[PDB]
Amino acid sequence: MNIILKISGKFFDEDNVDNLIVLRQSIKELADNGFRVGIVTGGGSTARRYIKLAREIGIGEAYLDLLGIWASRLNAYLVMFSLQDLAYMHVPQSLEEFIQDWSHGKVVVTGGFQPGQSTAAVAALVAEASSSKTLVVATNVDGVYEKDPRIYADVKLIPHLTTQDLRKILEELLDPLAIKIVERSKIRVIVMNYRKLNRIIDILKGEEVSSIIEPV
Amino acid sequence: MNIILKISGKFFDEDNVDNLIVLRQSIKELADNGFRVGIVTGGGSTARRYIKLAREIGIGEAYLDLLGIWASRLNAYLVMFSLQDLAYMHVPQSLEEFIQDWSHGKVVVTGGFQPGQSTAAVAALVAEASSSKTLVVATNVDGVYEKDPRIYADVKLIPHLTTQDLRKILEGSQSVQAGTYELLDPLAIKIVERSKIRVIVMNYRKLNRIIDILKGEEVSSIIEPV
Amino acid sequence: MNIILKISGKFFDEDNVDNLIVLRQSIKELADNGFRVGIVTGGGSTARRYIKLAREIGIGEAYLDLLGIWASRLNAYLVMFSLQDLAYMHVPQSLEEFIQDWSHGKVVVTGGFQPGQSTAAVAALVAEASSSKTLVVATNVDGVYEKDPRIYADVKLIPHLTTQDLRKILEELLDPLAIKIVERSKIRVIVMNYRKLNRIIDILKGEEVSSIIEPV
Amino acid sequence: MNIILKISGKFFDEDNVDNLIVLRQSIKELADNGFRVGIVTGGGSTARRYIKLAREIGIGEAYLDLLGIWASRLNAYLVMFSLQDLAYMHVPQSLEEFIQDWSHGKVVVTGGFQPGQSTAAVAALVAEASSSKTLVVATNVDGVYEKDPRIYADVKLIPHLTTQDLRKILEELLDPLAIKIVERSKIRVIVMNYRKLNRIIDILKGEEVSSIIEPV
Amino acid sequence: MNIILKISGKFFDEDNVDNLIVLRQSIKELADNGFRVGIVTGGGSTARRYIKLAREIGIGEAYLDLLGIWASRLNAYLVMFSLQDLAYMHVPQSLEEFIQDWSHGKVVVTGGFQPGQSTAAVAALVAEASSSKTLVVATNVDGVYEKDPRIYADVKLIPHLTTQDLRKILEELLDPLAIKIVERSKIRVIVMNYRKLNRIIDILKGEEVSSIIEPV
Amino acid sequence: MNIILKISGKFFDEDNVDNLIVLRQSIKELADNGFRVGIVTGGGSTARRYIKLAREIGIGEAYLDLLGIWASRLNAYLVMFSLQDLAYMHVPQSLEEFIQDWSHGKVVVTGGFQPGQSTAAVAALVAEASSSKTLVVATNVDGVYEKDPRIYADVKLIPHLTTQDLRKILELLDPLAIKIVERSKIRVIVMNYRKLNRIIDILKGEEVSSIIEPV
Ligand SMILES: Nc1ncnc2c1ncn2[C@@H]1O[C@H](COP(=O)(O)OP(=O)(O)CP(=O)(O)OP(=O)(O)OC[C@H]2O[C@@H](n3ccc(=O)[nH]c3=O)[C@H](O)[C@@H]2O)[C@@H](O)[C@H]1O
Ligand SMILES: Nc1ncnc2c1ncn2[C@@H]1O[C@H](COP(=O)(O)OP(=O)(O)CP(=O)(O)O)[C@@H](O)[C@H]1O
Ligand SMILES: Nc1ncnc2c1ncn2[C@@H]1O[C@H](COP(=O)(O)OP(=O)(O)CP(=O)(O)O)[C@@H](O)[C@H]1O
């Protein structure tokens, strides 16, 4: 079974050894349970700092996105280096390169690809290219809520929903490209807290707090 | 300053020497008028044919898009080879590669980059990266109409509109499938809006009048970013 | 052991799903019988079409050949994508790249390399580099005929011959570089109909209609 | 002439629009005065943060250096993007790539190359490969002091010294590779405060506060 | 006007900087006279030393050619490094890469490309791709002779001949691919002594001992 | 376990078949004993020859090193081609590329990377990146001596020493090589390449060699 894990950039902002460790464990563990794993890393606050500074000097939007992409790639190298023998030792820069890299039978870690999208879209593209039926989005909230839970207090986690529900809820988590891709290739998305990465197998069994998004 | 020309795949389906001859001429005329030019080529019926066959054997959507991309790149090599000394002799395979290639001060010709988008999105990205204020979409209709002019008769060509208008004209008509025919896709519109790029939709049959079109003195549609 | 299969461009001109299905099937068959397979695809009518148009506008012969090479590569991607996990996911652009790609232990699919030759020469080069003792040319024709079966009716098939017989017959199929390479490295060439890709194992035993060309 | 500017990673830690801006004008100015410019960017606090976290999870020293190198490249992209038409739009990853990139006649911006050295060593190697006779180290101090001015109060700036003096002062500013290279190729090094980049032409004339290091 | 210059590997066997100095001189002579120059270097005795040793341990013919190609590339780097600012600083490894490298408007130096041919064939391909109407073969003999002048003593130089004559004379210098290419693209070939490289302009004007081969 | 074997350029200057056949058999000996092997080849006399000529025409030091690097790469291709199926068929040009190449589970053969260092420094970098605990330097001398045995008569072989001893002796291994083996605690064995036939015995400490302990 092939699975893709998107790791929120916020995971890297914590500057917390435990995050990396728990991720390392989780990949080792998925492997032992017969999964091939691809990982996509977000840009986080590093991306936002570089983007903000570049924007203030008039750097255009393409190049701003590219700085965000390089920040995401820095996080990809960190993860890749933490996996040593498990991972193919190259961070692909495009979907085309990911396909080549995935051919080596090992874990592949990637950052961004192209301006105008997020790393959630990259995770979807990479899930599609690897025939992964499940994309896990490991982020800093427990699942999908009615509204953004870091604005709105007492908002309820939605354990099971569709991509058409999600679109309405979102009007970052998943961008338009990500949703288009998971819909056309019928990829199931699980949104979970990265804190619960130590419990990843239980989440895939549906035993633990998460949101499951069905493609329609 | 800089301009991007998207050339519809349908231009290549015609298999006509005059098409290439006239594109070639227009580029020279743009250069001689002080423009740097980037060119994006569509995949056309070659793309569709490969996509259809691959889809019949169960090949997934990512790989279908890639076949479409490789068909577009074949057209890009044709165009690039027709330009000889004017062009940097490399077809970039990503936006990042385009930026590097654009650095050589010559014409750059590209095809597709990534699954889930069209060559119009590529042309928008490449316009954004080259600080082109104008993207020209040279296609097999004279401009933008209220509805598809190859489906609906005596709809009127819309000479000047906004991206908001275009979004409504094109809304609800587009499939997520590899090989879908589009004018401008969602990524293309997002990009031209965020970077304030004006889009001119014209017939490639009038590439011989490319300067007059830029001056607003020939049949075309001008789309203003909002 | 290692075998190279050249697939005529005419195979791709048929725009027939059943062809790909049998190629796919014939390669899994070879793998299951202990063969490592490399595949070279021809440019076919797409190549001739681009070449003709480019030639009309005065494009030089190097660039015409390159357009034919890119058309061949488009067919290589199609075949590579049809093989999914069996193939290393990269189409090598040179013999040097083929050697690197072959190092991954998987099926490698290539198109052309260099102006002034055909994809048959590429297949020979790739046979030589992979220590393949046999090169199979799967074409639109049953074998080597006394002359061109496209043009002449009732001409007969030569089940067996040498590389100088072939040169004399030819002065398509195999070009000068292809013959020089198979002669210097003593590679046997089997010419067969791509329809018969199903009996590829029977053809290799010598138990189906084909022409075997011995290197001298 | 050709000149190389090393920009301390501390320049990027300031998260200050002013810094990038003043650097932008300095290259434009150097260009207008007939200089070809190469730029090498340090990794700064981003590099330190990634290295510290990776070290805590047992990542080996090669990979720690590589994280520092990727952080320095992120800063190189920022600078390169700020220069737009003036710069060749590729960040070289080795000295060999730098030499190819430098061939385009434009500004080249680089980060790190190889574990076991600093970006000062990169700036030296790049100065040597570009036949630059002057390397400017633009850092967060006015020049070379008797001892580290960020530690030792009341220490005096040394306006003119040799590479053997510097070696004794240091026993990072310049590492062993950097010193070896500037000695063997007789490259003069100017240490200056990056805050005075606005005044860069006056520094090259010797008419502003700086330290000039002569190769011996 | 574009011209290609093939420099015999024997030029590099001589182990003398006077040869490089004259070649270097020759290229400035050509540039200053309005020529764009491409250079192809032979492998010489280094290639022969590696091929012989590899052949003794049973290394196959593809790989023997590749060792010869790498030897030719070492000579290409030497020449390219001797040209400094005049040359684009990349040695292309294929015809496709040459075309990209030629796009920079500078001198391009190459070695070999592909097994089964010589550097003369490379020079022809590169002449064809650069629209060069003249290929100069600078070798250790004054021109073309009625037979190999190092094997049969006292034979006459042929100052003016055709490619059909040459193919009869040769039944080294130019291989079958080289001849096919210069014929199809109508490229004139001048065979000269590399000792007379100082007098390339006079040779191009037909005022110095050489053989001119006309394509038929 | 992972091991790196640095082969002196002098090995390639000798021009005899046995050398290659006997390197070839060692790695197959090492592989069969459970080792993953990386190999770094020196530039030898080919390097010095190109360097000397280029230096005479005024070519700068960066480009002289690069010519030496290309000569080392030519030796790497020779070795790689002699190993056939055992090796990943790419010579990496940087430490970054080596790491990617090493990911294929096969033998990787490298030459130089970067001006200002030697192929011994490459071997140390590559040992560090592959988590090799042992770097073998197979050279034209039996081990480490109190001083250069070519330049000095009657000197003795030191069977066991530290990296701090070695840098006093050298005032084989360059400064980057020593820094890297010290920071990553890599043991270096210096041996004669003529004894590549008894490489397993050398690793067990059962033949003539010098072992250098990192301090
Ligand atoms: N209102 C209105 N007014 C005027 N015309 C309209 C209107 N509404 C519809 N139309 C119609 O648009 C048509 C013009 O569209 P056209 O010029 O052909 O542009 P197209 O792009 O569709 C053809 P084309 O120019 O051939 O190229 P594409 O198809 O982009 O690319 C091929 C294929 O490759 C894939 N791909 C490509 C690039 C990339 O980065 N990623 C990718 O995945 C993807 O699967 C692609 O499908 C025209 O005939 C009208 O009838
Ligand atoms: N309906 C909803 N339910 C849950 N979370 C929502 C939401 N709407 C918005 N969010 C927000 O989505 C955020 C997660 O996005 P995520 O951080 O994983 O993407 P990312 O990797 O792009 C972040 P970065 O920009 O830092 O890389 C949450 O922190 C939450 O505030
Ligand atoms: N004596 C002979 N015996 C058999 N076939 C012959 C022949 N002489 C010429 N041919 C022709 O050679 C063709 C086979 O060549 P093939 O099509 O395999 O090469 P290719 O892949 O280069 C074609 P494309 O240019 O379409 O890619 C047959 O269709 C046949 O007409």
Ligand SMILES: Nc1ncnc2c1ncn2[C@@H]1O[C@H](COP(=O)(O)OP(=O)(O)CP(=O)(O)O)[C@@H](O)[C@H]1O
């Ligand atoms: N004798 C001396 N004179 C001046 N500065 C000295 C010094 N000895 C040490 N330094 C220190 O050198 C520092 C500058 O090094 P620099 O910041 O240029 O290297 P770098 O780019 O490697 C830093 P980073 O690790 O942030 O990238 C100063 O901040 C100063 O504290």
Ligand SMILES: Nc1ncnc2c1ncn2[C@@H]1O[C@H](COP(=O)(O)OP(=O)(O)CP(=O)(O)O)[C@@H](O)[C@H]1O
């Ligand atoms: N008919 C003929 N006229 C002149 N020279 C001939 C010849 N037939 C053979 N030769 C030989 O060809 C040699 C020139 O070949 P050249 O050295 O240019 O090719 P090359 O670069 O392949 C040599 P290397 O293999 O050393 O690189 C001469 O030394 C000469 O002895």
Ligand SMILES: Nc1ncnc2c1ncn2[C@@H]1O[C@H](COP(=O)(O)OP(=O)(O)CP(=O)(O)O)[C@@H](O)[C@H]1O
């Ligand atoms: N104390 C010492 N003990 C042993 N050898 C010493 C030495 N000091 C210097 N050397 C010299 O170093 C040589 C070994 O260097 P080695 O050949 O391993 O490096 P290398 O591969 O860079 C050579 P090349 O430059 O030819 O490729 C010995 O033959 C010896 O001459």
Ligand SMILES: O=c1ccn([C@@H]2O[C@H](COP(=O)(O)O)[C@@H](O)[C@H]2O)c(=O)[nH]1
């Ligand atoms: O393929 C990608 C991935 C990321 N980004 C940019 O990099 C930032 C960091 O990624 P993320 O963590 O926000 O998804 C994004 O906000 C966006 O600007 C892209 O442009 N394209």
Ligand SMILES: O=c1ccn([C@@H]2O[C@H](COP(=O)(O)O)[C@@H](O)[C@H]2O)c(=O)[nH]1
């Ligand atoms: O290595 C190659 C392979 C193909 N071709 C060109 O591509 C066309 C397609 O190959 P084939 O299928 O015709 O052999 C050929 O006619 C030829 O022009 C080359 O120049 N070199």
Ligand SMILES: O=c1ccn([C@@H]2O[C@H](COP(=O)(O)O)[C@@H](O)[C@H]2O)c(=O)[nH]1
């Ligand atoms: O070529 C280089 C450049 C940088 N670094 C690493 O990246 C850090 C950031 O560069 P600097 O700003 O410290 O020079 C260094 O301390 C060092 O760990 C290297 O290993 N090699």
Ligand SMILES: O=c1ccn([C@@H]2O[C@H](COP(=O)(O)O)[C@@H](O)[C@H]2O)c(=O)[nH]1
């Ligand atoms: O494209 C090339 C160039 C060179 N060689 C090989 O390298 C040797 C050196 O080239 P030359 O100087 O003999 O032409 C040749 O004998 C030949 O084996 C090739 O195989 N292909």
Ligand SMILES: O=c1ccn([C@@H]2O[C@H](COP(=O)(O)O)[C@@H](O)[C@H]2O)c(=O)[nH]1
């Ligand atoms: O990483 C390397 C490897 C080699 N060399 C150069 O190549 C020569 C040949 O390598 P070696 O065999 O001396 O180690 C060296 O003297 C040196 O000039 C380098 O500059 N860097």
Ligand SMILES: [Co+2]
């Ligand atoms: Co985000």
Ligand SMILES: [Co+2]
């Ligand atoms: Co370039």
Ligand SMILES: [Co+2]
């Ligand atoms: Co053909």
Ligand SMILES: [Co+2]
């Ligand atoms: Co530092």
Ligand SMILES: [Co+2]
């Ligand atoms: Co690989």
Ligand SMILES: [Co+2]
């Ligand atoms: Co040495």
Ligand SMILES: [Mg+2]
């Ligand atoms: Mg379309």
Ligand SMILES: [Mg+2]
């Ligand atoms: Mg020869």
